[PDB]
Design a protein around this ligand. Structure first.
Ligand SMILES: *[C@@H]1O[C@H](CO)[C@@H](O[C@@H]2O[C@H](CO)[C@@H](O[C@@H]3O[C@H](CO[C@H]4O[C@H](CO)[C@@H](O)[C@H](O)[C@@H]4O)[C@@H](O)[C@H](O[C@H]4O[C@H](CO)[C@@H](O)[C@H](O)[C@@H]4O)[C@@H]3O)[C@H](O)[C@H]2NC(C)=O)[C@H](O)[C@H]1NC(C)=O
Ligand SMILES: *[C@@H]1O[C@H](CO)[C@@H](O[C@@H]2O[C@H](CO)[C@@H](O[C@@H]3O[C@H](CO[C@H]4O[C@H](CO)[C@@H](O)[C@H](O)[C@@H]4O)[C@@H](O)[C@H](O[C@H]4O[C@H](CO)[C@@H](O)[C@H](O)[C@@H]4O)[C@@H]3O)[C@H](O)[C@H]2NC(C)=O)[C@H](O)[C@H]1NC(C)=O
Ligand SMILES: *[C@@H]1O[C@H](CO)[C@@H](O[C@@H]2O[C@H](CO)[C@@H](O[C@@H]3O[C@H](CO[C@H]4O[C@H](CO)[C@@H](O)[C@H](O)[C@@H]4O)[C@@H](O)[C@H](O[C@H]4O[C@H](CO)[C@@H](O)[C@H](O)[C@@H]4O)[C@@H]3O)[C@H](O)[C@H]2NC(C)=O)[C@H](O)[C@H]1NC(C)=O
Ligand SMILES: *[C@@H]1O[C@H](CO)[C@@H](O[C@@H]2O[C@H](CO)[C@@H](O[C@@H]3O[C@H](CO[C@H]4O[C@H](CO)[C@@H](O)[C@H](O[C@H]5O[C@H](CO)[C@@H](O)[C@H](O)[C@@H]5O)[C@@H]4O)[C@@H](O)[C@H](O)[C@@H]3O)[C@H](O)[C@H]2NC(C)=O)[C@H](O)[C@H]1NC(C)=O
Ligand SMILES: *[C@@H]1O[C@H](CO)[C@@H](O[C@@H]2O[C@H](CO)[C@@H](O[C@@H]3O[C@H](CO)[C@@H](O)[C@H](O)[C@@H]3O)[C@H](O)[C@H]2NC(C)=O)[C@H](O)[C@H]1NC(C)=O
Ligand SMILES: *[C@@H]1O[C@H](CO)[C@@H](O[C@@H]2O[C@H](CO)[C@@H](O)[C@H](O)[C@H]2NC(C)=O)[C@H](O)[C@H]1NC(C)=O
Ligand SMILES: COc1ccc(-c2[nH]c3ccc(C4CCNCC4)cc3c2C(C)C)cc1OC
Ligand SMILES: COc1ccc(-c2[nH]c3ccc(C4CCNCC4)cc3c2C(C)C)cc1OC
Ligand SMILES: *[C@@H]1O[C@H](CO)[C@@H](O)[C@H](O)[C@H]1NC(C)=O
Ligand SMILES: *[C@@H]1O[C@H](CO)[C@@H](O)[C@H](O)[C@H]1NC(C)=O
Ligand SMILES: *[C@@H]1O[C@H](CO)[C@@H](O)[C@H](O)[C@H]1NC(C)=O
Ligand SMILES: *[C@@H]1O[C@H](CO)[C@@H](O)[C@H](O)[C@H]1NC(C)=O
Ligand SMILES: *[C@@H]1O[C@H](CO)[C@@H](O)[C@H](O)[C@H]1NC(C)=O
Ligand SMILES: *[C@@H]1O[C@H](CO)[C@@H](O)[C@H](O)[C@H]1NC(C)=O
Ligand SMILES: *[C@@H]1O[C@H](CO)[C@@H](O)[C@H](O)[C@H]1NC(C)=O
Ligand SMILES: *[C@@H]1O[C@H](CO)[C@@H](O)[C@H](O)[C@H]1NC(C)=O
Ligand SMILES: *[C@@H]1O[C@H](CO)[C@@H](O)[C@H](O)[C@H]1NC(C)=O
Ligand SMILES: *[C@@H]1O[C@H](CO)[C@@H](O)[C@H](O)[C@H]1NC(C)=O
Ligand SMILES: *[C@@H]1O[C@H](CO)[C@@H](O)[C@H](O)[C@H]1NC(C)=O
Ligand SMILES: *[C@@H]1O[C@H](CO)[C@@H](O)[C@H](O)[C@H]1NC(C)=O
Ligand SMILES: *[C@@H]1O[C@H](CO)[C@@H](O)[C@H](O)[C@H]1NC(C)=O
Ligand SMILES: *[C@@H]1O[C@H](CO)[C@@H](O)[C@H](O)[C@H]1NC(C)=O
Lengths: 738, 735
């Protein structure tokens, strides 16, 4: 068995295992070793001795600085990648192997970039020297022609370093150059002259407009802007990506894009370009542009009636996504978005955080191929008759959940002023398949007329509201509806001054997924039971099943009997102390996954599993269960996954593992188990027992011998499996015993 | 006194009592045995207690068994509180001397003559929450209240009655009949009730809302059927509650014989048409409070509010509640009939979702004092049964705010930044609330120029930026400033964080900087003010501030010369540096360093504070106390040290401080109190301590008997930890 690193080209994961030093137990066959988030303090030549097969070594966040001897990695010949991040290193380690192709030195205290450390390494492709001298500083010392010898360099990152000037003598092979928040106020023609192969140029954060940033922001004196020369990007012909975010730009010189025929992505967010959006000459110079970001460009204290979009926006023929966040405007008219209508590839429109009070929705159907319409964090009212390896100015995450957007045209009206669904709310709207009405504080009594204008909605998100759906015809106008998220609608079910009805689910012929999480359901009249012929997944978490199954007339006994096709059921956080035998028998036999975790269950009747021949997964985590059954094979024969973590199980019954043949994954971690008998000890692949108070004496010897015989049964995080008694054996692992 | 605390009223509430204690003194006039595990009540329970006038037995247990004539021996008994006892019927053998009897939250399904008709001296009778959603109808005997000739108040609310009870006494002044399921009201119901000042008919055929009690509306959403001559002889009526009655029209004939009506409740009805055109408004000349809240039409969001011209006839009107009408815009012409009313001081426009208001209309009013526009959509301009269930009795604005003058409430609106015309054409406002607006304005000092006489300003739950030295300085008269829950700015890593504007104020007395997470105050590094007396610096990061490697935030509170109160709670403080504690204001009288992680406290530094009277150090990790506290402090009266790790009290601690009156040592790790450690003390708390009840505890027990004046609260909670046989019982209960 591999200890402490988990073996899986073979990769040995040794991340976060409380290691004070480099382990010698690591096999010679190992090609990739990850020693991240450990308490290692010293790195010597003996640490990686006799390990020629290693190509990648990760030593990030060591400790929680790190001391590296001269030529400690020099013995390694096949070493290509070396990750040395957040180690608090005062300088670049001397004696690095020349065979390296990737080197990262982020979040360190390296204040000097000398030729004695990086110039010797000519085989380097990617070099990362970020967050070194950043608010400590005064200026990052760069040697003259220190990157000139690096002829194979494709990527160079010098971002978040007090540089003040662009480093001279850069290699012509450079494809990606990052210079974000480098305090470089002036950009000249000689800076990017001999860089013909550049596809990306990041000049963001220089003279910035301060916002919600995790890094210290210092704006330029007297509200100064970035001084970029007219011929600065004269020979940048292969450029596809240009990041000019937080540069305090007031005007865009169209001469910058004269030699850019391939530009695909342009970032101009967090600038003062309201005037340039209204009248911009640069827009006619971008014919192959796919992504344009003009977010948070607003004038301070200015709340205009309409958005001023330039007519030249029609020249953006290849445009796919347009991000117009933080412009801050009152109303959006049909004439305002007229130049964008003639674009065939435009599928994404981002109008988030604009505080728009009114939108003439007739304009959206007058578009060629709209797929995503994001109008979240606006003021639409009812219509009546940290990691350094991430983009800090662009949200890389999707605007709409992929599961929603997969159905078709997605409309996001979440975090708006729709306090009730008006009769003209969805009038003159396109054929919407995905609709989000989250956190709108909506208290509408759903009758089944509200969604008649858009009846092809297959995925509907109604989370964080106060909706009423007592009507049998509620949401039924949406016949094609497959996914319904009614999470955090607590207000209705919590109040005793109503009725609580769930008959609307019956009318749906295609509803597959339903989420009723954190609604606080305790009473149901007149329909005590819920039924659906098409439903496969039901999330009934964060409710009150304890009161429901405590009924003195047994009226909610067959509450899940009507769900014939149900395969997945989540009954977690329901405050369940005990489940009645008859109430558990009435559960769907078609079930494959069942989650009864984070409850207060003291007892579980395993005999009732005989009526479920399709059940593969059973979750019973974070409960108050005391014991397990000795004849599990006689009841279940289809169960593959069984989760019983954070329970009060002290003893495993005789012949438990040598009974259920179908079982592959078993969780018994963070319990009250002391010893595992020979009688209790197949197709098992994974077994968790970490955080258990194990008695490491002679009685534990029977279980240790089983671990050696059954190697295939992988036990994760072996270091966390700590002995409780005796005192001398306390702290050490169960496999570490002699 | 054990277990009840004598004050003559003996407080015996929440003490885990399984039975009635016999240790209660004969001199006791009022006994409160509420919230206890008492199950049986007999004639021996209150034996030899003739001096008792009031007996409270509410929530017992947490049902209760009462024998026949258990209270009959008591002659002076006037008030008897028997609530939430799960009693199946009225106890037989009640004393005739009773003037007040309450039987709320019980299971009494029958009101017989054998229980209440004998009691003729009764003034107030409460029979609420008895047969409420269980029993199909509450059984009332014919003329059961007829014998009660001295009855002034009668409550039959929250009981399935269906009809008004017949044969009611003429002496009745207040009659409550809320949620009684009474669909029909006839002339014979309130015929012989000439002395009625209040009539509550609310909750009959109701419009269901956010209610804790089960709401069942009438068949097909039907309205209450009140006869034209139902209130024909109700001449003395001042209060009329007709809330949640599903009313569509108001018959003006109801107010024909009502010249004294002062308060009218018509909330949670369907009276939009009545507000637009109502004949009833001309019949109310002495009306002071009118409530027309949540009268909106379902699915209707009108452009403007339709106010009747007849609203000008309400001459005596003081407060008007127009909540939940649901309208888009408020114009000057819409509030024209109200502008001529001289007594109108309160206008409640809360939860109306108003997008735009012509703020010009408010200066046209005669005497406006409160303008509540909370929970609206204004954007930048460029449970207990003894409470009112349909009216919020609590004030709209905090009294401390409203005391300064004209109060304007714009909390929970869409003001995401303060616009240049935000307060244009506004009256002389002294109290302003801009809470939970998500306001992210970079305050320069021009924002509040239109209303510069604001003395109390509430900016809580926002995202505001105040790094400018001239921020909020346009408000020269400002006395109270609440900047609580404005964490976002100070929380984000690396910006500016300045507080130079405080020194500018010539009369600022109270400042609240709670839950802001201030950790890097650059530069100015310190807080200065020559006028400030109170500062709440709770929920911040003083741990990082006093951990500075250059000691730049050492004199952070040196500038506050007149500061008397300081709250440094929940600041994650592990240790306070000696120099940082020396730089604290000497003028301080109250200091709160509670709910932190303080392991040590230097008591020697208290010598530089000769005015300090209160010192709070609750919920900390402090291990020990000082033995020479008299040598450092001589003005300290109150000292709070609850929920700490103090295991031993030093020798001669209590016999040192002469100014100390209140000392808190509850929920600590103290085992025994020595004779050496054991004056002007009045109160001493030691409850929830692991006391070793053996022979070593004998020295402290003798001190308790000698010093009777030193009152020890909640003696039952002072439980012995060791040994096992003595575990559970109190320290004073030992033999
Ligand atoms: C200015 O604007 C530019 C764009 O114009 C931004 O540039 C991007 O910056 C991000 C962050 O540094 C880069 O993203 C990272 O790329 C790594 C390499 O990607 C390769 O592998 C993927 C595999 O799917 C390929 O698709 C891709 O083509 C590459 O070959 C990833 O490994 C990184 O992932 C990290 O996070 C994930 C979790 O999300 C983890 O699983 C990983 O282990 C890892 O830690 C990451 O995605 C991106 O490549 C840059 N764009 C380009 C085109 O180069 C600048 O960031 C921006 N400046 C500022 C300051 O905002
Ligand atoms: C109300 O309840 C619903 C239903 O439970 C919730 O919606 C589901 O949310 C979960 C996440 O919590 C979603 O599951 C995730 O899907 C990701 C994307 O799916 C890809 O992979 C699958 C693989 O079969 C492909 O079929 C598919 O086409 C996609 O390409 C996965 O990447 C996620 O995996 C990660 O987590 C799992 C553990 O859960 C790990 O095993 C993985 O290694 C990985 O780390 C994950 O499976 C699910 O798709 C959602 N369903 C629907 C219908 O949308 C709502 O979120 C909930 N509402 C609220 C408010 O809580
Ligand atoms: C329909 O509308 C009518 C009004 O038109 C409402 O009637 C009011 O109902 C409330 C609640 O029952 C009454 O308030 C209670 O009054 C009790 C008696 O007050 C006298 O004693 C105090 C002593 O200080 C005097 O100040 C006062 O002037 C009276 O002489 C009090 O005992 C109650 O207080 C108790 O509860 C509160 C918490 O709620 C505690 O803080 C107190 O300490 C105390 O324990 C309470 O104040 C009110 O008096 C009624 N009005 C009139 C004029 O009679 C109906 O409630 C309403 N119906 C519905 C269903 O909403
Ligand atoms: C931010 O911080 C501020 C300041 O700390 C917070 O505002 C204070 O909030 C507290 C409550 O948390 C208020 O204190 C209460 O005041 C009540 C009203 O007091 C008057 O009415 C009493 C009626 O019984 C009356 O006795 C009293 O007079 C007595 O005052 C002194 C009391 O010791 C005494 O010395 C006098 O001689 C006199 O007899 C008052 O006239 C009271 O009923 C409560 O018991 C309690 O004391 C403060 O008044 C508030 N201060 C201000 C300036 O408004 C604020 O809430 C915090 N913000 C947030 C969001 O948490
Ligand atoms: C300014 O406006 C805000 C918002 O209207 C006021 O805040 C509100 O204040 C009340 C009273 O302090 C809060 O009520 C409290 O609720 C808790 C929980 O139910 C209860 O335990 C308390 O006894 C009390 O009733 C209310 O929650 C709070 N609302 C919000 C959104 O914060 C504020 O008081 C106003 N300030 C002034 C000076 O008028
Ligand atoms: C509907 O909109 C809400 C709000 O924009 C989305 O909720 C956010 O989801 C992300 C990712 O899960 C979280 O990090 C945020 O905290 C959520 N915000 C809030 C306010 O809840 C929701 O995911 C959207 N749903 C769909 C299907 O797109
Ligand atoms: C002085 O002028 C101004 C000052 C502040 C803003 C202001 N206030 C906000 C409040 C909340 C938010 C949130 C919304 C929810 N999501 C997170 C951002 C955003 C803003 C903003 C802007 C950034 C758009 C605007 C201004 O001029 C247009
Ligand atoms: C079908 O028609 C309608 C259905 C629902 C309402 C609706 N929606 C609300 C959302 C939130 C609140 C909150 C605000 C914060 N404070 C607590 C009440 C209130 C409402 C309401 C009303 C009660 C005024 C309005 C309707 O017609 C006008
Ligand atoms: C640690 O660094 C110091 C630098 O002075 C060096 O003397 C020492 O040998 C290094 N290695 C170890 C194992 O301490
Ligand atoms: C590219 O660089 C060369 C040499 O500096 C220069 O002559 C040429 O004008 C540049 N190209 C453009 C298009 O400006
Ligand atoms: C479009 O670009 C051209 C560039 O020469 C400019 O002259 C014109 O004014 C722009 N159009 C608008 C509407 O500003
Ligand atoms: C689309 O745009 C044109 C103007 O270009 C307008 O006349 C028309 O009404 C819009 N809508 C539809 C449905 O054609
Ligand atoms: C239920 O909806 C129907 C139409 O969908 C409507 O006629 C009916 O009034 C609604 N029921 C209630 C009780 O509002
Ligand atoms: C529902 O169950 C029936 C059983 O006959 C099956 O035919 C049908 O395909 C199932 N539907 C879904 C959506 O799983
Ligand atoms: C399990 O349930 C059955 C009834 O279905 C019952 O006979 C049996 O005793 C139960 N077992 C336990 C351990 O509760
Ligand atoms: C109530 O107390 C009397 C005492 O005489 C007893 O006879 C009766 O059974 C008690 N009732 C209950 C339910 O214990
Ligand atoms: C209220 O208005 C009446 C008008 O009839 C007036 O007599 C009375 O003095 C006013 N009340 C106050 C407190 O001024
Ligand atoms: C309201 O006051 C303004 C002066 O501020 C005046 O011009 C206007 O006529 C007044 N309106 C009414 C209805 O009295
Ligand atoms: C501070 O406020 C003044 C006006 O009081 C303004 O001129 C100045 O621009 C503000 N400072 C900043 C940095 O915004
Ligand atoms: C600060 O105080 C001075 C003197 O009182 C005065 O200029 C003003 O009140 C404040 N300064 C500004 C620029 O607002
Ligand atoms: C502030 O302190 C001075 C000390 O001379 C005193 O005169 C003044 O009255 C105090 N002001 C307040 C508001 O307490
Ligand atoms: C208290 O502070 C003084 C300095 O003001 C120092 O001399 C003394 O040792 C401190 N006492 C303790 C117990 O830390």
């Amino acid at each position: 068995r591999s200890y402490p690193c988990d073996e899986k080209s073979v990769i040995a994961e040794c991340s976060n295992r409380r290691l004070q030093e480099v382990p010698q137990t690591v096999g010679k066959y190992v090609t990739e070793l990850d020693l991240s988030d450990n308490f290692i303090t010293h790195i010597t030549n003996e640490s990686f001795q006799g390990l020629q097969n290693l190509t990648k070594i990760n030593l990030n966040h060591n400790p929680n600085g790190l001391n590296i001897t001269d030529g400690a990695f020099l013995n390694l010949k096949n070493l290509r990648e070396l990750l040395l991040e957040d180690n608090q290193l005062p300088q670049i380690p001397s004696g690095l192997p020349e065979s390296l192709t990737e080197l990262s030195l982020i979040q360190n205290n390296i204040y000097n970039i000398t030729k004695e450390g990086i110039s010797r390494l000519i085989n380097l492709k990617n070099l990362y020297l970020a967050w070194n001298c950043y608010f400590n500083c005064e200026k990052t010392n760069i040697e003259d022609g220190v990157f000139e010898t690096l002829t194979n360099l494709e990527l160079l990152s010098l971002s978040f370093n007090s540089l003040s000037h662009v480093p001279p003598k850069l290699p012509s092979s450079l494809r990606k150059l990052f210079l974000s928040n480098t305090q470089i106020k002036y950009i000249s023609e000689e800076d990017f002259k001999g860089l013909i192969n550049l596809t990306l140029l990041d000049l963001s954060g220089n003279c910035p407009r301060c916002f919600n940033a995790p890094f210290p922001c210092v704006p330029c004196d007297g509200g100064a802007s970035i001084n970029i020369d007219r011929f600065a990007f004269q020979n940048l012909t292969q450029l596809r990506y240009l990041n000019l975010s937080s540069t305090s730009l007031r005007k865009i010189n169209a001469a910058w894009f004269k030699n850019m025929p391939h530009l695909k992505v342009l970032d101009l967010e967090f600038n003062y370009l309201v005037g340039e959006i209204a009248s911009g000459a640069f827009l006619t110079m971008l014919p192959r542009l796919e992504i344009l970001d003009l977010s948070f460009n607003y004038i301070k204290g200015s709340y205009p009636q309409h958005i001023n979009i330039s007519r030249n926006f029609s020249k953006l023929l290849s445009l796919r996504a347009l991000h117009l966040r933080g412009y801050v405007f009152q109303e959006l008219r049909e004439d305002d978005f007229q130049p964008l209508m003639q674009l065939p590839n435009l599928s994404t429109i981002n109008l988030g955080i604009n505080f728009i009070k009114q939108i003439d929705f007739k304009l959206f159907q007058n578009f060629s191929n709209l797929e995503i319409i994001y109008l979240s964090e606006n003021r639409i009212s009812p219509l009546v008759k940290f990691d350094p390896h991430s983009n800090f100015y662009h949200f890389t995450r999707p605007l709409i959940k992929p599961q929603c957007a997969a159905y078709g045209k997605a409309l996001d009206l979440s975090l708006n002023s729709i306090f009730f669904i008006g009769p003209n709310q969805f009038e003159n709207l396109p054929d919407i398949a995905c609709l989000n009405l989250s956190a709108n504080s909506n208290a509408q009594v759903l009758s089944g007329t509200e969604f008649s204008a858009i009846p092809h909605v297959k995925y509907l998100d109604l989370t964080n509201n106060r909706l009423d759906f007592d009507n049998a015809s509620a949401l039924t106008e949406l016949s094609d509806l497959e996914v319904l998220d009614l999470s955090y609608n607590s207000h209705y079910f919590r109040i005793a001054g109503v009725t609580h009805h769930l008959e609307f689910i019956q009318n749906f012929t295609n509803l597959k997924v339903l989420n009723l999480s954190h609604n606080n359901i305790y009473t149901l009249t007149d329909k005590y039971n819920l039924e659906s012929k098409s439903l496969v997944e039901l999330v009934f978490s964060g409710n009150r099943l304890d009161i429901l199954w405590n009924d003195d007339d047994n009226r909610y006994i067959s509450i899940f009997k009507g769900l014939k096709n149900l395969t997945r059921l989540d009954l977690s956080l329901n405050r369940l102390k005990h489940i009645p035998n008859e109430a558990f028998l009435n559960l769907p036999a078609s079930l494959t996954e069942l989650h009864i975790n984070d409850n207060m269950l003291k007892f579980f009747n395993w005999t009732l599993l005989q009526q479920f021949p399709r059940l593969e997964l059973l979750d019973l985590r974070g409960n108050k269960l005391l014991f397990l059954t000795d004849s599990l094979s006689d009841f279940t024969s289809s169960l593959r996954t069984l989760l019983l973590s954070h329970n009060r199980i002290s003893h495993l019954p005789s012949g438990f593992l040598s009974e259920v043949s179908s079982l592959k994954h078993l969780d018994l971690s963070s319990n009250l188990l002391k010893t595992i008998n020979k009688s209790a000890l197949t197709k098992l692949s994974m077994l968790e027992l970490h955080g258990n108070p194990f008695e490491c004496t002679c009685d534990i010897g029977d279980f240790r011998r089983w671990m050696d015989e059954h190697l295939n049964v992988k036990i994760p995080r072996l270091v966390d499996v700590i002995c409780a008694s005796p005192g001398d054996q306390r702290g050490k692992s169960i496999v570490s015993l002699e």
